[PDB]
């Protein structure tokens, strides 16, 4: 398991930008942090 991270993104413009990538496109747990919007990790 991995937690992809993006630098310049919010929780809306990530999904728009083989089937595997669609899993992280929408995301069941999205965190918006300073460094960006890291995908796959749950904040506690």
């Amino acid at each position: 398991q991995v937690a992809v991270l993006y630098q310049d993104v919010n929780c809306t413009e990530v999904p728009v930008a083989t089937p595997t990538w669609r899993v992280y496109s929408t995301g069941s747990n999205v965190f918006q942090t300073r460094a960006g919007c890291l995908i796959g990790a749950e904040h506690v």
């Binding site: 991270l5 993006y6 413009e13 728009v16 930008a17």
Partner: protein, 49 residues
């Protein structure tokens, strides 16, 4: 650890055209058609529309 791989891009989604309402016609004619000329000395640059 944390590693970096690539950078996701976003592509366009449409394109169009827009031009004025002007139209003429000189397909190598009005501009390029014989037009008897004078000697080399009288080579004035005539103006065309």
């Amino acid at each position: 650890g944390i590693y970096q791989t690539s950078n996701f891009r976003v592509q366009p989604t449409e394109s169009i055209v827009r031009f004025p309402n002007i139209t003429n016609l000189c397909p190598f004619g009005e501009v390029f058609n014989a037009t008897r000329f004078a000697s080399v000395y009288a080579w004035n640059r005539k103006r065309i529309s």
